[PDB]
Amino acid sequence: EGLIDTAVKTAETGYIQRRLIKSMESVMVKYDATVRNSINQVVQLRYGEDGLAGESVEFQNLATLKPSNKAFEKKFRFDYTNERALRRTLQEDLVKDVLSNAHIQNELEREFERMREDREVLRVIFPTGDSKVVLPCNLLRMIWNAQKIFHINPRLPSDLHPIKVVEGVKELSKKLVIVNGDDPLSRQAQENATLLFNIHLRSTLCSRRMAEEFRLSGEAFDWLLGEIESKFNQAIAHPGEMVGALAA
Amino acid sequence: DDEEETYRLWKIRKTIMQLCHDRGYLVTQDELDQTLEEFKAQFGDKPSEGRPRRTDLTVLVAHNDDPTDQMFVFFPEEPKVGIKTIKVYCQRMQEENITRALIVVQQGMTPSAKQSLVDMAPKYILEQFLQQELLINITEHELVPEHVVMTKEEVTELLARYKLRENQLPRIQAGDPVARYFGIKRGQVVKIIRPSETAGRYITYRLVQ
Amino acid sequence: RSCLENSSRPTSTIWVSMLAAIGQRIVATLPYIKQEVPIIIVFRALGFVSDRDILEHIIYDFEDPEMMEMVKPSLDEAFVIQEQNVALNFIGSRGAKPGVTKEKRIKYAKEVLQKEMLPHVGVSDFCETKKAYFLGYMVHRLLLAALGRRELDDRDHYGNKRLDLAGPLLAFLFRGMFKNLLKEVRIYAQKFIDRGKDFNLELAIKTRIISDGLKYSLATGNWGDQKKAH
Amino acid sequence: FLLGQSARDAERAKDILCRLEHTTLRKVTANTAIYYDPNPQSTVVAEDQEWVNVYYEMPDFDVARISPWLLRVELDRKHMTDRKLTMEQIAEKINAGFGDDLNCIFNDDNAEKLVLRIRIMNSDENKMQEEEEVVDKMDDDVFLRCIESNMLTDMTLQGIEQISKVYMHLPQTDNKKKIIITEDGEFKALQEWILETDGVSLMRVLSEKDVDPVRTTSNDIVEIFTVLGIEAVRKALERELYHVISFDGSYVNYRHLALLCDTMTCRGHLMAITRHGVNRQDTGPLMKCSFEETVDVL
Amino acid sequence: QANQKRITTPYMTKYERARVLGTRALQIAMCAPVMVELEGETDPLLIAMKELKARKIPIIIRRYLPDGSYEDWGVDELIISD
Amino acid sequence: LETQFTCPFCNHEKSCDVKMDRARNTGVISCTVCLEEFQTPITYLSEPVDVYSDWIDACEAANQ
Amino acid sequence: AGKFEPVQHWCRAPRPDGRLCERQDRLKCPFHGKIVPRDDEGRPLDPEDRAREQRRQLQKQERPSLTNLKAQADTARARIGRKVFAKAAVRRVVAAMNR
RNA sequence: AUCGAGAGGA
Numbered sequence A: 001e002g003l004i005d006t007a008v009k010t011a012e013t014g015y016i017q018r019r020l021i022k023s024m025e026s027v028m029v030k031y032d033a034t035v036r037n038s039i040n041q042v043v044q045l046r047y048g049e050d051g052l053a054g055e056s057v058e059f060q061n062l063a064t065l066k067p068s069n070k071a072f073e074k075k076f077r078f079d080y081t082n083e084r085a086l087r088r089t090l091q092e093d094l095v096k097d098v099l100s101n102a103h104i105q106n107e108l109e110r111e112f113e114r115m116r117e118d119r120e121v122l123r124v125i126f127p128t129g130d131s132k133v134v135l136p137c138n139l140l141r142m143i144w145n146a147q148k149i150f151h152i153n154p155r156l157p158s159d160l161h162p163i164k165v166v167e168g169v170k171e172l173s174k175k176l177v178i179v180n181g182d183d184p185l186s187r188q189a190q191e192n193a194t195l196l197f198n199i200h201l202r203s204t205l206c207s208r209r210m211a212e213e214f215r216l217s218g219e220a221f222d223w224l225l226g227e228i229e230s231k232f233n234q235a236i237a238h239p240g241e242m243v244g245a246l247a248a
Numbered sequence B: 001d002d003e004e005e006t007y008r009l010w011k012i013r014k015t016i017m018q019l020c021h022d023r024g025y026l027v028t029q030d031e032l033d034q035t036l037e038e039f040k041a042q043f044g045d046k047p048s049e050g051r052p053r054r055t056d057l058t059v060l061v062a063h064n065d066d067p068t069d070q071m072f073v074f075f076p077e078e079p080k081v082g083i084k085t086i087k088v089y090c091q092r093m094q095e096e097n098i099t100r101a102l103i104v105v106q107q108g109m110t111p112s113a114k115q116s117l118v119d120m121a122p123k124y125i126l127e128q129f130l131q132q133e134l135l136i137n138i139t140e141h142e143l144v145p146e147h148v149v150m151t152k153e154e155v156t157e158l159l160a161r162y163k164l165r166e167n168q169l170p171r172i173q174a175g176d177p178v179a180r181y182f183g184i185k186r187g188q189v190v191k192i193i194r195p196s197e198t199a200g201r202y203i204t205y206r207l208v209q
Numbered sequence C: 001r002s003c004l005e006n007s008s009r010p011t012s013t014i015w016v017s018m019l020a021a022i023g024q025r026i027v028a029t030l031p032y033i034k035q036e037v038p039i040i041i042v043f044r045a046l047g048f049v050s051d052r053d054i055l056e057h058i059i060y061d062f063e064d065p066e067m068m069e070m071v072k073p074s075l076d077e078a079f080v081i082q083e084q085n086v087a088l089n090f091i092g093s094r095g096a097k098p099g100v101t102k103e104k105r106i107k108y109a110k111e112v113l114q115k116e117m118l119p120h121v122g123v124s125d126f127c128e129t130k131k132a133y134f135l136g137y138m139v140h141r142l143l144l145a146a147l148g149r150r151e152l153d154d155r156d157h158y159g160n161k162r163l164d165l166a167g168p169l170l171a172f173l174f175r176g177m178f179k180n181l182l183k184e185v186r187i188y189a190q191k192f193i194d195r196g197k198d199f200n201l202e203l204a205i206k207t208r209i210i211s212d213g214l215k216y217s218l219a220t221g222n223w224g225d226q227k228k229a230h
Numbered sequence D: 001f002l003l004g005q006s007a008r009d010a011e012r013a014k015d016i017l018c019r020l021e022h023t024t025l026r027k028v029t030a031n032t033a034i035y036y037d038p039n040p041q042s043t044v045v046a047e048d049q050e051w052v053n054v055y056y057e058m059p060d061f062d063v064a065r066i067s068p069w070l071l072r073v074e075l076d077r078k079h080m081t082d083r084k085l086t087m088e089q090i091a092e093k094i095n096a097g098f099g100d101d102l103n104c105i106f107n108d109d110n111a112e113k114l115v116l117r118i119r120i121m122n123s124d125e126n127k128m129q130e131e132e133e134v135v136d137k138m139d140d141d142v143f144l145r146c147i148e149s150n151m152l153t154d155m156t157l158q159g160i161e162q163i164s165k166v167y168m169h170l171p172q173t174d175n176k177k178k179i180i181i182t183e184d185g186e187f188k189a190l191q192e193w194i195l196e197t198d199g200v201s202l203m204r205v206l207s208e209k210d211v212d213p214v215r216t217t218s219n220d221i222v223e224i225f226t227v228l229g230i231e232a233v234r235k236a237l238e239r240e241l242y243h244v245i246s247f248d249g250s251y252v253n254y255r256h257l258a259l260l261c262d263t264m265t266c267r268g269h270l271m272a273i274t275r276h277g278v279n280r281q282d283t284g285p286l287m288k289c290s291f292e293e294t295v296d297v298l
Numbered sequence E: 001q002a003n004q005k006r007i008t009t010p011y012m013t014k015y016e017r018a019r020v021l022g023t024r025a026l027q028i029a030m031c032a033p034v035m036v037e038l039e040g041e042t043d044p045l046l047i048a049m050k051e052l053k054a055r056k057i058p059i060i061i062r063r064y065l066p067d068g069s070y071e072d073w074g075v076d077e078l079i080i081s082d
Numbered sequence F: 001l002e003t004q005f006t007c008p009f010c011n012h013e014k015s016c017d018v019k020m021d022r023a024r025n026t027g028v029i030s031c032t033v034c035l036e037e038f039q040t041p042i043t044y045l046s047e048p049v050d051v052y053s054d055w056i057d058a059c060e061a062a063n064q
Numbered sequence G: 001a002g003k004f005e006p007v008q009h010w011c012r013a014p015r016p017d018g019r020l021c022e023r024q025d026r027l028k029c030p031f032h033g034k035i036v037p038r039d040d041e042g043r044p045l046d047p048e049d050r051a052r053e054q055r056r057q058l059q060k061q062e063r064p065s066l067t068n069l070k071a072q073a074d075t076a077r078a079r080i081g082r083k084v085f086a087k088a089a090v091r092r093v094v095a096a097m098n099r
Numbered sequence H: 001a002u003c004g005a006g007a008g009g010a
């Protein structure tokens, strides 16, 4: 029976392979980053739905999807009020700034509110709570690389001000562009094409995890932002990619 | 038996009010969420006794943007609607000066009535629904993503942004269940918002054909 | 697939089939007859006229009413034909050329029933009892299958199969070649008897037919007439 | 998928199962017989005079209209009670299907045998139209055999005609369990009854009273396209291809499946990966001829 | 299309790199002048790769858009990813 | 089977057609060239060629 | 998934004889309609349901030329025949028979 | 040299 199946299955599968190629052979990423057929009809406005090449993405976990509300708050909401925990996590001039500067405290609070909103968006996208997702830049491995390149001692307080984390992640998000243009259609399509990656970026690279868990220094964080930018741009699909023949 | 017909009539009414609200006609929250016992209280519990008659079920609604833009919903009593009944509704629409109506039919519609819906279409737009296809609102089903009918201005902005002709958009048939639900005609565009497991969200656009 | 014990002709296949008030009707696909015949008409053409006498060939124990109920629709269907001559006419109306006289249609039907239907049971006259019993056995086997009392046959079961070796394979060729040789001997000699004079048979026999037919088929492996190689 | 308590109580799930699965009279009938029973007052079947007389010793129907041919059907208790079906409903379905032209009477459920008695009711004028009493087809016993053959197989007692079988089970796998977000914000899986069917009739099933109309779905994509439209079949086709590809644990990057499903659906209708789809696009003739139908295309 | 707002990606594609290197190598083999100093390297394709890394290749890439417009980009304007 | 026949009287080929009047259990065969017609009782088993055979037999019976 | 035959109750409306009914119908009685609880003289045990049932009993108590060729087309046996011999009906039957 | 057939390899 195994010899029969080995001899008989092959014609049907090879015919399926042929028909798929002949159905998709001219489907290509254009220089406008839309995916179009030979009659120039739009099949996808961005390849995949995200503009990325398939070879440059890898499995990652969305850290905010599964936690309970208490564990989410405990892990992600920066506590600027426990002076001794700050003193154990941040150097003295940072603790003095964070304890007193109400503007910085408001920035940290609305950082957390943006994570809370992102969590509710994820809960709609992944209603079965499977956190496993495929995304371009492996953030945890890049953080582990920064930890080793810059000899980060996990047991000492960091010089990295949490406001530099908030601002740096806001500025990085503006450089990861899949849909170009200032008009509201471009702006909305850009927000959509990068929503899940930006949720992952904000939740991984939040001020509290950078203080308590990753303990990166300022120079290591400055390196991490450039690494993420460079690796994201290398993941974008190249015009002329014959993505139909690849899919077939 | 009457407990079945009254439930059917209630469900159909609820779906029609949801449809009217989604088309943008002014529908109150109270009638949008009316419960079965409130339907029994307002219209009756024995339609075989004629309580309600399906003539009692008729709906008239006006658009949120223009109180003179109005639509009927008619529930013919006969199971298989013929041209006589269409002519009666055409007359009522002419005297009330109402250009849109939905005709909800129990079993079907005659070929002559079907053609009569085509042959008056520029001045009076009549649409057919079976009652069976109104017993569930298909737009609540998890496979159906959010459909938003675009304005002509928004279509001009879309085509200008992506520098494309209408014939280069992907299509939707005018007979598509959701196109029929929204009542969209040839040459309109529907924006579709769907979640995506790789971007997070994706919008696509379909030209009605 | 009936074949006479000596291969004077190729096999002829008879099908008796049960069709998919409505009831299960049994019909025969006989050779050289254009249309399926109700089996009870075939039995009447073989000369068994009463329904009881027919069922005695098909249902060996009458105290079995489940089989009786299953033959009953076929006794109903054929009841309009009740005499052997009408049945032989009915069969002969089909297959025979439409214009021929009644005697020729009857004779055609008798010829099919003797020589073409079930030749392994016999090709002689007075074989009709043997043929009625075997055709009755065929219907009985079909009834046992329809009632689920006997299992359907397996085409893979090697008891149901035969291996044609070199001998039978060469005999198949040599029959056709000897027939073509006799044909050509008739064709040669007739244009001498048409010319009123005796012929030398040593010139009539074109020995190339056998010598090159067997040689060609063994050379190429096309097992048949060289003219029909595809 | 079921709503409400019918998702927890197995008896309510079984009630919906009976509401879906097609049951004809044959599925609940043990045997049928046709009798010459010319006087219901002295029925030739002995075992049932005690109830038959109770129907005729009252005025609602007239023995002068009764045909002497009786159709007698015996039902069996297990198949009736597995369906919560009653002979009052069976008779109601008979009279709904044939009107007043056909008379039916039935026994008490106290009996060890469930029986109903059917005969043609001849409410004609007694015209001397005596040429075979009908212009061509049949006598009443052959006609009643035809009525039996029809009633056994083309009379519906419950269910949807296309739904040949229904199964119910608890899903062991979380992909079919209901997932909820708790008040504490955790995901939780709920083990609830689902029904799986052989045969499809999505539009009828969605409209059943306790069926969850949000989650219930077919695997037939043409049914999805007909009931729910082009974007629904775009999502369902992705689900079905994903299920086939992932069944052995293999993984293919989503964008390949997405691009195939978009190619199959961008024209607004289900385009087959076959000459009947690919070679009906606006692609030029040289592209078409490289696939199939080479000479006819040109 | 106006040149003041080019909208195509500023990165050179893998296909552009491939064809630019091939075309430039064939030019060098046909005795086109070389825009870089050579450490005695003689292979036209190695020379082309030196000129690519130097940003000295005298070639314009004309990127056609789906609407039939185009953008002209110099090889020295593009970011080289390899 | 063939459903058009040569006329026994006028020898024209495919000139006779059969009308199966099932409701009256009677079959009529008519020649379009000479309009000779014949009627025979038919059964549900009966077919055009049985009507033609009945006509040829009636003709040969009249030659006696 | 369980099954039982709880039919200890009886239809207890009066017969035309004035004797009470004794038929063990489950839910509908051919002579009496939908079954309801009734007293020792057959009156419903519901002041309102006995009124709706009395109104239903009142509704039940409240409810030349040559031989036209259509007059043979209305007989009961032709009405049944047009169903049972319908081409679609006979096909759906034989489709179920082949299965 | 072509056409056809058969036997083999992965």
Ligand SMILES: [Zn+2]
Pocket (backbone or CB within 6 Å): F007, F008, F009, F010, F011, F012, F015, F031, F032, F033, F034, F035, F036
């Ligand atoms: Zn003639």
Ligand SMILES: [Zn+2]
Pocket (backbone or CB within 6 Å): G011, G012, G013, G021, G022, G023, G025, G029, G030, G031, G032
């Ligand atoms: Zn009673």
